[PDB]
Design a protein around this ligand. Structure first.
Ligand code: HEM
Ligand code: HEM
Ligand code: HEM
Ligand code: HEM
Ligand SMILES: N[C@@H](Cc1c[nH]c2ccccc12)C(=O)O
Ligand SMILES: N[C@@H](Cc1c[nH]c2ccccc12)C(=O)O
Ligand SMILES: N[C@@H](Cc1c[nH]c2ccccc12)C(=O)O
Ligand SMILES: N[C@@H](Cc1c[nH]c2ccccc12)C(=O)O
Ligand SMILES: N[C@@H](Cc1c[nH]c2ccccc12)C(=O)O
Ligand SMILES: N[C@@H](Cc1c[nH]c2ccccc12)C(=O)O
Ligand SMILES: N[C@@H](Cc1c[nH]c2ccccc12)C(=O)O
Ligand SMILES: N[C@@H](Cc1c[nH]c2ccccc12)C(=O)O
Ligand SMILES: [Mn+2]
Ligand SMILES: [Mn+2]
Ligand SMILES: [Mn+2]
Ligand SMILES: [Mn+2]
Lengths: 266, 264, 264, 266
């Protein structure tokens, strides 16, 4: 159909022909497994689309626009987090009926997910290997890898307005994951200590805290779902499974924002 | 097949987002993805509802309930996701709505499948799918088969319930009409849950499914209202809220009351 | 004050659940707690909405938005919690509904406060609170004061917007009537968000608040429908869905369209 | 008003006069702080009410009734978990405006919460000390402490139907928290390996997994909220704060149910 019809515009012939279970005979629960991932991948694509715009707004000092885009980003992350409730209706007995059809593949190979991790700041050049089979996508990942993260662009925004931001944030090896910077503590303390004056900065700090918290919630529900489905069995990717996902919850995108809590109003 | 992206056919899935606006409008991606995620969930919902029907045809109560439990969760995601589209403002929509066609989800085959399966049969709807004789035939099969509700009634008939003989054979293509003779049947079930726990649990599962479906319809309407404002249009969506899949289940609420409980 | 239970006054709070059924019916506790949690949330909502009004009176936009953000979250909890009551079946309710009085949340003072604050003023409602002259007077104060919406309009008037002079002084006890002269005002705001971002963001916050409130009304109605089935009754709840707090905000959707964007 | 009026039935004069902020002047955000806890305490009271009934149903082999009560229990836990989203709008700058008015009190002193923990199996006789000031409530906690938990009643249910349940579960020191029992693995493996036959047991196992998962989600959101409000500052109760809440996520009510995942369909 033409791009002006409902199905043609949405390219449903292509979208709705992408569900191909491998189990033989076809296991009833494999459709859920596939759709759970595909809906997530679509939301991740939208999330990346929105986050990229949030970065551009920050670079241009467009605060309200940045916040609006981040508001939608939070709603998308919330859908990604809420949907785990569907997959939790998948029991170990059902999963073991087709887990074998799956190869040594895993979410590790999710290009879109890695894209988000990179955009938020959890850079990992060593992650470019898993996508060696695909140079095209690998290239797009490299771009974000070599560019300032959402968090670093926020720091650059603060720098443009006279905040005491270290000179290194003007230019450095962006491919290296951000490391907790103690010198940023006084910067955020000032913001939280005078919110009427630094309302723009204050609102953005809380938006970032919201984003990270929602992301961690996604990681937690992910881990808990894996736990109830495969328990402590090793993952098809090669990790310890739950153990590895448990360590992921220890990661932090915006450490200084959480650390400042300990000194606010001291 | 062997890799994450290969198994999930992501090259195909992630190349299905093609905005028409040019210069490309930032908010068109949301418009597309909002529909596509919904279509994927609707496909899963049909997959599960078909299984629920099979379980009823096999007198498999707990299995039917488990499948319906997942169905409720899928309907819940479809309902909750409207919150994302609510961030689409009139200012943003007016920037790309002009390049879009004049259709809506009214043209969704997957959605019509759900309506049909639940019992809201409409032979006239087959016309809109004339362009697709394949999907038209696939939809006609559901149209000619008993709905999820009618299969529940047939299940009840197989176990002593006073289900009218008409439910054994009739023109299933016609949408179910409220049957007052079913009132005593549901009253007996709700008035003796200790004995009719299977039937009672299924009745409540159906009420859950319909209620969640109505919530989807309401959130849909409220989202459309805040985007384009106020048959067809939002008026048609308002009328959809007056539709009911399992009327007798809601009607029985007004007459249940016999107390068959033992000494307490 | 010094201890957890003392500070939260739990001895008082947790001794307020007194079922009337005897023998006590297991499901009456839910009925009570469902109402009490809602009343607590409504109290917080009034607390926040009052603050939102103060911020508008002080031209404090970001503060108003932050308070409204919390208000939306409170309304969301009030809406989501209906899922708990949906597990109350007709079979269970018929076991204790007889000992209950003939009233409903229509008699909720806290709820009426919210309706009034949002603009749905009704002097006649003061009568139902005649038994409580104190609460009647506290409610009358909100009745005689500009609503959250009218304070938003007054804020707009202070900054060059073509707000009618009538909004400077009038009988606030009367519910706001749809004003077509406000259409060009909101069109200008939505057609130049780069300049009117403050106004644009507040307009959308109000649409969010009203939409979430309507979702609460809908879930309320659907829950009542599945418990007791189908002016007064569910018919009255159905009519409540036709009420609107900020009509002009929804109406402008049908006429926005001027494109003031720079070259792109 | 009489118990037949709306306000009289719900005892609103008493319920709505229980919000007494201590800050001076009255801090705007203290009302949220109080109401957030009071709504939670009301849901916890309902949860305990429902869980007690679930236990009675299990003792009487009333499976569908038990499941229905657990379904409502899950919905209540979901409300308790979802509401954290309201409290997350409370920033460090707002909280520090009245955190001082609060004494050395903490959720540790929540009798209703401890009641739930005990009912689920996380027994701790040493926790009877914190409620020494209140012998009345302390007594009610002791009852559940000395009685079989929800999980142990499930095991006793399985025992009544011929499942290979250890004799110790017929009578033992219930005040002692349940310890992971390896001998239960074969019992749950059999259930998950033949769900058509053991559908009753299967459904109950999944209900318990649902309950524990939802409870852990509550613990996680609790911890994340504390993290964004007070950061890594020590709690008013006396613990490390986030660190302590982090260890709480390591606790498990029904270990055998999660451990069996590793051997299901081996
Ligand atoms: C049956 C349900 C699921 C199970 C058992 C499961 C299991 C796992 C395991 C064991 C890992 C660790 C790597 C390995 O050794 O394989 C992993 C990683 C990952 N999974 Fe899941 N998964 C499930 C569903 C999902 C869904 C629906 C998504 C959404 C697209 C997803 C996204 C991811 C991602 C993005 C990683 C990489 C994380 C990182 O590098 O931190 N998984 N999964
Ligand atoms: C802001 C975006 C949207 C607008 C303005 C809109 C508008 C409408 C309107 C006016 C109708 C009534 C029938 C007609 O006149 O064509 C309709 C129906 C429908 N729409 Fe929406 N829609 C939007 C987004 C969506 C999304 C994301 C979905 C999910 C796939 C969806 C699904 C449907 C369905 C399934 C019907 C058929 C309902 C029925 O036959 O009762 N729409 N839409
Ligand atoms: C199964 C239990 C419930 C039933 C059968 C029920 C029924 C009704 C009915 C029939 C009305 C219409 C006015 C009237 O005729 O009195 C009403 C109004 C109302 N109810 Fe519900 N209700 C229930 C639970 C609740 C709960 C838990 C709340 C939360 C506090 C609540 C809040 C309200 C409010 C605020 C109104 C006034 C609405 C308005 O004036 O638009 N109800 N209820
Ligand atoms: C401003 C928000 C909050 C903060 C900063 C906070 C902080 C803390 C901290 C630091 C602890 C550890 C013990 C200590 O050293 O004090 C704790 C424990 C606890 N809190 Fe929270 N809390 C908050 C809100 C809530 C709410 C709304 C509830 C719901 C009633 C709650 C329930 C509990 C419970 C039940 C424990 C005991 C847990 C256990 O023994 O595992 N808290 N809280
Ligand atoms: N972060 C929350 C609360 C919030 C709204 N506006 C704010 C401004 C500043 C700080 C926090 C907020 C939200 O985005 O809803
Ligand atoms: N890694 C998962 C399997 C898996 C989860 N999601 C996937 C998506 C595609 C392929 C495999 C997977 C496991 O250990 O069972
Ligand atoms: N029908 C809308 C556009 C639209 C809504 N939903 C759609 C789905 C697909 C394509 C277009 C649409 C219009 O008036 O233009
Ligand atoms: N219908 C609700 C409540 C429920 C659970 N089990 C039931 C059995 C019978 C009737 C209602 C129920 C649910 O599915 O969660
Ligand atoms: N009005 C209902 C009972 C009821 C509903 N909500 C209430 C709140 C409080 C007291 C009673 C009620 C009846 O017909 O009896
Ligand atoms: N109203 C939505 C979306 C939004 C965020 N910021 C905005 C600014 C202007 C208009 C809309 C928005 C929200 O509050 O999340
Ligand atoms: N545990 C999920 C899924 C479920 C429903 N019925 C079941 C029966 C057996 C196992 C799991 C289920 C729920 O309660 O909704
Ligand atoms: N323990 C919390 C204070 C707290 C949270 N909830 C409470 C309820 C009552 C009294 C104190 C509290 C802190 O460290 O800040
Ligand atoms: Mn059979
Ligand atoms: Mn009768
Ligand atoms: Mn000022
Ligand atoms: Mn005009």
């Amino acid at each position: 159909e033409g791009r002006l019809t409902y199905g043609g515009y949405l390219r449903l012939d292509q979208l709705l022909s992408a569900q191909q279970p491998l189990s033989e005979p076809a296991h009833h629960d494999e459709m859920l497994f596939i759709i759970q991932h595909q809906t997530s991948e679509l939301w991740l694509k939208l999330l990346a689309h929105e986050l990229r715009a949030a970065i551009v707004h920050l670079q241009r000092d467009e605060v309200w626009q940045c916040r609006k885009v981040l508001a939608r980003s939070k709603q998308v992350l919330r859908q990604l987090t809420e949907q785990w409730s569907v997959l939790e209706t998948l029991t170990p007995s059902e999963y073991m009926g087709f887990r074998d059809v799956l190869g040594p593949s895993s979410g590790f190979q999710s290009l879109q997910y890695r894209y988000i991790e990179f955009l938020l700041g959890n850079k990992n050049p060593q992650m470019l290997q898993v996508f060696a089979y695909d140079p095209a996508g690998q290239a797009r990942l490299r771009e974000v890898l070599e560019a300032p993260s959402l968090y670093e662009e926020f720091l650059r925004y603060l720098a443009r307005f006279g905040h005491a931001i270290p000179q290194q944030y003007q230019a450095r090896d962006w491919t290296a994951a951000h490391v907790a910077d103690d010198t940023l503590r006084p910067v955020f303390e000032r913001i939280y200590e005078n919110t009427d004056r630094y309302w723009r900065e204050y609102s953005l700090c809380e938006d970032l805290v919201d984003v990270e918290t929602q992301f961690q919630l996604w990681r937690f529900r992910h881990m808990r779902t894996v736990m109830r489905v495969i328990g402590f069995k090793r993952g098809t990717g090669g990790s310890s499974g739950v153990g590895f996902l448990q360590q992921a919850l220890a990661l932090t995108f915006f450490p200084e924002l959480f650390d400042v809590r300990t000194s606010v109003g001291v």
